[model samples]
Target chain A: GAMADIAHEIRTPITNLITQTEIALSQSRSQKELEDVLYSNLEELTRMAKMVSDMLFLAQADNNQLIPEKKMLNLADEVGKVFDFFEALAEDRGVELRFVGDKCQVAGDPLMLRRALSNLLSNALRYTPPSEAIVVRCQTVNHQVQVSVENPGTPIAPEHLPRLFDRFYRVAPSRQRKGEGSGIGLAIVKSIVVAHKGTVAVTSDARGTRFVITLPA
Target chain B: GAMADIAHEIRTPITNLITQTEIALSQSRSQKELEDVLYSNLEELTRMAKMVSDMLFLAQADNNQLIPEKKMLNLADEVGKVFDFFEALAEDRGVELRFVGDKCQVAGDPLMLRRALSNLLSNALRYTPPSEAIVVRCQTVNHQVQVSVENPGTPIAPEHLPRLFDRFYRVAPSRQRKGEGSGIGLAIVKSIVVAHKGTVAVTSDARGTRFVITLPA
Candidate 1:
C-alpha cells in the first residue's frame, strides 16, 4: 500500500519534469529560455527533496529513533515563534492569527515540536477563509500539556477525517501538486507528536476544524 | 521490502539536492555558477524521474497491464537496433560488440523487449572489461526465441546473484549513485520479460556474466 501510494504521489512531479524538459529541448531555444526551464525544474526538485526528507523522518519515527535530542521546552514560546513566522502570510491572506496561551512548559524536542505546530498552523491557514481567525491555545489539564490549533473553515467530511493524517493522502484528489504541502505534512505532525509520547487529533464540526496535541507534562 | 528499498534508493539523490541547494544559496553566487548548479540538479531530477517511471512500469507488470501492444516480431531485428544504439558506447569503453545467430521471430511487445535487451546489454557493458566482447545472440530452440547477452568481467558472488535483479539491490554498496542505473533497471528487465510471457535469467562465473531471455516463437 505504501509503495503504491508513494509511486502515485511522486508520478505527478516526475511527469512534470519530463514534459517540461521535453518541450524545452523539442527545438533549439535561447539561453534565457533554457535557464528559465531549469529554474522551474529546481523548484520541483526541491519539492521532491523535501518529500523524501519527510519520508525519511517518518521512517525514523517508525523505528523509534525520532527524538534524538530532548529537553525542557516552553510550549508557549515554541508556538509563539511559529506564530511569528506565519504572521505575515496570515495577514496577506486576510486571515487573523491569535495566540492565547501562557508560558506552558514541557519536556520535548523543540525542533520537532515546532515542526508539528508549523504543520498544523499551515494547514489551518490554508483552510481558513478570509477574515477568519486562527486561535492557538496552550494550557495544562490534569498534569498534561494541551496545545490546540483551531480555524474556521468548511467542515471536513467524516469519510476523509480518518485518513487526513495518512501519508500522500489529499482531501481534494484533483488538487494541483504545485505550491501544496508534500502530502506528508500531517502525517509528519502525527509521527512527531507520537514520538514524544504525545497524542495529536482533529475535530471538524459546524464551527471549524481543531487539531489538538496533548503531551505528558 | 519494496517500500524500504525505494526509500533507500531515493534518499541518495534527495540528499544530493538538499546539500547542493544549501551550498548554492549559502551565499550569493554568479549567474553562471547558479546556472551550473541548476543543470546538475536537472540531471539528478531526471534520474529520479526515470526511477519513478521504471517503478511504475513494474507496477503495471504486477497488475497484468503490461504488454499492451504485443505483436509478432523478428527478435534479431530488435537486438540489431539495440546493439547499433550501444555500438558507439561500447567502443568508447574500449569494449567490442558482436551480434550472432539469424533472424528469429517471436510474439511480444517490441518496445518492451527492446527495453529488456537494452538493460541487459547496458549491464553487460558496465561489467565488461576493456577489449572484451559483448555477444548478443538470437536463436530458436524448442519453438522459443532465445536471446542472450554475454560479457566477460569479474564474477558476481554467489550470494549476490540471486538478488541481482531485486530493485535497489546493489553489488557495490559504496558505488556512487551518479550515472548508475536507477537501481530498478535489472528488476524492470525481469518484469518486462515476464510480462511478455517469457523467462529471463542471469549467470555469473570467472568467464563472465550472462543474461538470457526466451520468448514464445
Candidate 2:
C-alpha cells in the first residue's frame, strides 16, 4: 500500500523534471538560466527521496518489521486544514477553492490521511485553470462518507481514466502541462484509501473532472 | 548482387553529406553561416533522396522486378581513387592515410566498388585519431579478392560490434561525435559485399580495428 502511495506521489515531480529539462535545453539563452534549470532538477530529485522515505516507513510496518503508531482522527477537519493551505494559491489564481457539504469523520493515521488529501487537493489545483473555481464536497453516500473534489477541464481521454491510479504511468508525454501535479497523486490516494478499507474513483464529462474518495462510515 | 552494389554506391556521399552538415551547424555563428548550415542540410536531404532512389532500384532488382547489370573492372585502382578524395582531409588532421596492394582485377560496377571502398575508408578516418595512420589494403586470399581498411582506436564495445551494420542503429546519441560519418556506411558496405556473393567481417583489438571485404574470384 505504501509502495503504491509513494509511487503515485513521486510520479508528477519526475515528469515535471523531465519536461522542464527538455524545455530548458531547447530554450535557454544564457548560461545562468541553464544553471537554474539544473538546480531545479536536483530539487526534484530530493523531493523524490522524501517520498521514498515515507514509502519505506510504510513498507516496514506492513512486513511486521515495525509497529505503526496509530491514533484516532477526525478526517473532515484534517482535509479542511489541507484545503486551507491551498487557499492563498487558489485566491492568487482567482479560483474559488473551498470545502463544502457536511463534515464527515474517520479513524486512522491523521498524518497519512492529511498527506493523501493534500495530494488530491493539490492535483485538482494544478490542473484547474486560474479562472476556474474548485469545489471540495464531503457527505455520506451509500453508507460511506465520501470526499469529492471537482474542477473544470476537458474530459480526460477515456483510456487514461482507468489507469489513473497506476504508478509511473502518464498520459501521453504531450498531455504533461507545466507545473501540473505529479502523476502519482491519484495512485497515492488509491493506496491511502485502500489502507483504510475505502474506495477511490473518478468520473468526468464536458462539465468537469471529479475525484471521489469513499470511506466506511 | 545488384542491391549490394547500389548500397555501396550510396553509402560514401551520404556519410560525407551528414558530416559536412553537422560541421556547418556547429561552427555557424552569424546569420550568413546559419543560412549556409540550412543550405547544407537541404543538400544532404537531396543526396539522401537520391540514395533512397538507388536503394529502391536495387530492391526492385532483388525481387525480380529488374535484372543485374554486370561488368568486368579493375577493382583496386577504382577503390584507390576514392581514397584520393580523402587525402586532403587526412593531411588536415595530420594523419597518415595509405592504400596498400596491387591493381587487382574483378567483375563489378566501378561506381559501386568505389562507393564500398569509400565507406570503409570513411569509417576508418572518422575513428582514428589525428597523426595516426589508416591503411587500406587489397589482396587475394583463398582465390577471393579481399579489401580491408584498418584504423587505430579503442575496440568498439562487444555489444555494439554485432549491430554495426543495422540500418538507422547508432551506438549511442554520441553519433554527434566530431567528424563521425553517418551510421549507415557499414550497412551499405555489407549489402554491396553480399551482392557480389562475397563476405565482410570486422575484427578489433587494443591495437586497432579492421574491416575485411571478400569477393569471389
Candidate 3:
C-alpha cells in the first residue's frame, strides 16, 4: 500500500516528462523548444529526486540505521535557522515568522534536527494565513529541550487526528493548491524524531494547532 | 509485474507527502490550511482508489475474466480520438500531427485499443521534432492490420533498441530529459499488442525513429 502511494506520487512527473519529450520530438525543435521542455523537466525532476532521496533517508531512519555523530546543538539556534530558511516563504503569504525564548545544549544531528524543525516551520509558513504570526519556542523545561512550533489557524477535525501521520494518507485529496508539500515531510519528521531518541506529537483543541518536539537536554 | 511496478510508483509520492503534513501540523495553520490538506488527501485518495481498482482489473485480466463484446470497430476513428486527447500537448511542442491511412477494422476492446494508440501517438508527439510530421498509418496486408507511428528526430542507439519495450526501461537513463515516459507507455503498448496476438518493434536511423505494430485483421 505504501509502495502504491509512492508509485502514484512519482508517476505524474515521469508521465509529464515523457509526454513533453515525445511531443517535442514530433516537431522541429530549437534551443527555445529544448529549453522549455528541459525547464519543466528540471523542475519536476529536482522535486522528484529530493522526494526519493528523502524517502530513502526515512527508510534508513525507520530501520534504526541512521546513527550518526551527535554534537551539542542549540535548540534555539536551530529553530532560528529554520525560521530564516522559511522566512521568505512565510513572507509570501504575508505571515510573520518569529522566535522567542532561549534554550540550548542537545546532542543530536544538526542536519536532521534542522530538517525536523524545518518541516515544522514550513508547515507553519504554509498553513498560517496572512497577517498571523508563527512563533518558534525553545526553552529548557524540566531538564528537557522543548521546541514547540505554534500557529493560530484552526483546529483540525478530531476524526483525522490519528491518521495525521499515516504514511500515505493525504488529509484532503481533491483540493490541490500551489506549493503543496509532497506529504513525506511529516513521516520524515517522525522518523527523525525517533532517530534522535526524541518524541513528537500534535494537538488542536483550543489553542489552534501545535506540533511539539520533545528532546532530552 | 505491472502491479508491483505500480506499487513502487505509488509509494514514493506518499512518502514525499509525509513530510509535508508532518511539517504543517507542527504549527497553527490558517483557515486555508485544513482546506488545502483535505484537498490533497482527496487527490491522493482518489489516486489510491483508482490504482486499487486497476489492481482488481489486473487480477481479473490475469484470471481470463475480462469477457465483453469484441466489436469490429474502425481503427482510424479510434486512433483519431486518441490524438485529440494529446493534440494540445502536440501543439504546445510545435509539432504537426496527421493520420494517413485507409480504415481498418478489428475485433478488440476499444479501451485497450485507444490506450495502445494513445501511447504510440504520445510517443510520436514527444519524439518528433518541429517541421517534422508525426504520421499515423493503418494498413491491412495479408489479413493483418498494421498500425505504425513515425517520427523523425535524433536516432536512438542500437544498443537500446532491443530493450525499448522493456517495462519501465529508461528511454535513456543518463540523458533523461523532458517527456521521459514511465517506460510503461511502450511496455503497455507491447502488452496491448501481445494481448491482441500482435508484434511490436522500434527502428531508428537518420530518418528518425519508427514504432510499428502489426495485429490480426
Top of the candidates by DockQ? 1
Docking class of 1: acceptable
Q: What are the models' TM-scores?
A: 0.84, 0.41, 0.53
Predicted chain B of candidate 1, TM-score versus the true chain B = 0.90
Candidate 2 residue-wise lDDT at B54: 39
Q: How well does candidate 3 reproduce the true complex, by DockQ? A: 0.03
Q: Write the per-residue lDDT of candidate 2 for residues A17-89, one digit (tens) a residue.
A: 5466555545424544544554554455444444444344334334444422346556567766887788887
For all the predictions, what are the DockQ values? 0.31, 0.02, 0.03
Best by TM-score: 1
Q: Could you arrange the candidates by DockQ from highest to lowest? A: 1, 3, 2
Per-residue lDDT value at A98 in model 2: 69
Better of 1 and 3 by DockQ: 1
Q: A97-139 in candidate 1: lDDT tens per residue?
A: 8888777788888899898999898888778999999999889
Which of 1 and 3 is ahead in TM-score?
Answer: 1
- Model 1 residue A147 CA deviation in Å: 2.4
Score each candidate by Cα lDDT.
0.80, 0.65, 0.68
